[PDB]
Scaffold this active site. Structure first.
Site, PDB file in Angstrom:
ATOM      1  N   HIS A  40       0.825  -1.205   0.000  1.00 52.80           N
ATOM      2  CA  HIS A  40       0.000   0.000   0.000  1.00 52.80           C
ATOM      3  C   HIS A  40       0.868   1.268   0.000  1.00 52.80           C
ATOM      4  O   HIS A  40       0.370   2.372  -0.197  1.00 52.80           O
ATOM      5  CB  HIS A  40      -1.030  -0.017   1.125  1.00 52.80           C
ATOM      6  CG  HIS A  40      -0.486   0.370   2.461  1.00 52.80           C
ATOM      7  ND1 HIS A  40      -0.118  -0.558   3.409  1.00 52.80           N
ATOM      8  CD2 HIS A  40      -0.305   1.586   3.033  1.00 52.80           C
ATOM      9  CE1 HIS A  40       0.301   0.067   4.493  1.00 52.80           C
ATOM     10  NE2 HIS A  40       0.190   1.370   4.292  1.00 52.80           N
ATOM     11  N   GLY A 175       1.905   6.671   8.487  1.00 54.53           N
ATOM     12  CA  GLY A 175       3.269   7.120   8.339  1.00 54.53           C
ATOM     13  C   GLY A 175       4.260   6.053   8.736  1.00 54.53           C
ATOM     14  O   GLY A 175       5.382   6.089   8.292  1.00 54.53           O
ATOM     15  N   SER A 177       3.501   2.965   8.012  1.00 56.77           N
ATOM     16  CA  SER A 177       3.173   2.004   6.954  1.00 56.77           C
ATOM     17  C   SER A 177       4.416   1.551   6.234  1.00 56.77           C
ATOM     18  O   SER A 177       5.218   2.374   5.796  1.00 56.77           O
ATOM     19  CB  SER A 177       2.310   2.682   5.907  1.00 56.77           C
ATOM     20  OG  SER A 177       0.997   2.833   6.377  1.00 56.77           O
ATOM     21  N   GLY A 178       4.537   0.241   6.078  1.00 63.62           N
ATOM     22  CA  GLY A 178       5.598  -0.329   5.248  1.00 63.62           C
ATOM     23  C   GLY A 178       6.825  -0.581   6.084  1.00 63.62           C
ATOM     24  O   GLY A 178       7.733  -1.278   5.658  1.00 63.62           O
TER      25      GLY A 178
END
Ligand SMILES: N=C(N)c1ccc(OCCCCCOc2ccc(C(=N)N)cc2)cc1
Ligand SMILES: [Ca+2]
Length: 223
Positions: A40, A175, A177-178
């Site tokens: 995403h 923020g 994320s990943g």
């Protein structure tokens, strides 16, 4: 990261910031030319920023390397975030050093209760918004699959796990994320999703990296 702590400059040397003019996602350096992040987090024109602490200040340990290729998981479903994993190849090999280091992939999954380190430059507020400039860290256990699936009925797949605190107060957030979830020295999770941040009974949901090791290794070997 909500309820976490300042990691300390370069204490999480595999943590990368993905930047397209601004930090927008974390990622984890898995070897000198590959970062794993969340699907995403996909976008074109990614610059991977290695050796970052304060993402707003050049502190002297950074390496900024443009992505040459993004490979979103073949089965990534953006609707459900199932298979929320993506590989990003760096245009040039990161120079590995104390502050820029790869994190090992799991050779197996991790058990509920395993303590993990989750890190990122995401929002540090459970309510409202405050984005840290320095990297934030959270120790969080992997939650039972049942507690995970109970928290998010109909939404948790075998490719996700929950980590955090059902009581709330400590979680990753937007923020992050990943970014990495590292447990016993292995990347077991990628910051994927959740509901709000650090809310009671809404733990963080993480891509279950151990499901993807074959895909990661094969993809990297072929790209
Ligand atoms: N499952 C789904 N169908 C789904 C859930 C969220 C979502 O939203 C946009 C993509 C996710 C963007 C990142 O959003 C978060 C939210 C909470 C946390 C957390 N509290 N740990 C960490 C990251 C899309 C689909
Ligand atoms: Ca910096």
């Amino acid at each position: 990261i909500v309820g976490g702590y300042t990691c300390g400059a370069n204490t999480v040397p595999y943590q990368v910031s993905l930047n397209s003019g601004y930090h927008f996602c974390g990622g984890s350096l898995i070897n000198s030319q590959w970062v794993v992040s969340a699907a995403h987090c996909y976008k074109s024109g990614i610059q991977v920023r290695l050796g970052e602490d304060n993402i707003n200040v050049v502190e002297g340990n950074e390496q900024f390397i443009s992505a040459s290729k993004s490979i979103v998981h073949p089965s990534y479903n953006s609707n459900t975030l199932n298979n929320d994993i993506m590989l990003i190849k760096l245009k040039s090999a990161a120079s590995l050093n104390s502050r820029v280091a790869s994190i090992s992939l799991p050779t197996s999954c991790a058990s509920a209760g395993t303590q993990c380190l989750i890190s990122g430059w995401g929002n540090t507020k459970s309510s409202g918004t405050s984005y840290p400039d320095v990297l934030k860290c959270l120790k969080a256990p992997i939650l039972s699959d049942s507690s995970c699936k109970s928290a998010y009925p109909g939404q948790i797949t075998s490719n996700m796990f929950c980590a955090g605190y059902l009581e709330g107060g400590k979680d990753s957030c937007q923020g992050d994320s990943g970014g990495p979830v590292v447990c016993s020295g292995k990347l077991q999770g990628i910051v994927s999703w959740g509901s709000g941040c650090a809310q009671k009974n809404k733990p963080g949901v993480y891509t279950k990296v151990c499901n993807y090791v074959s895909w990661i290794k094969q993809t990297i070997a072929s790209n």
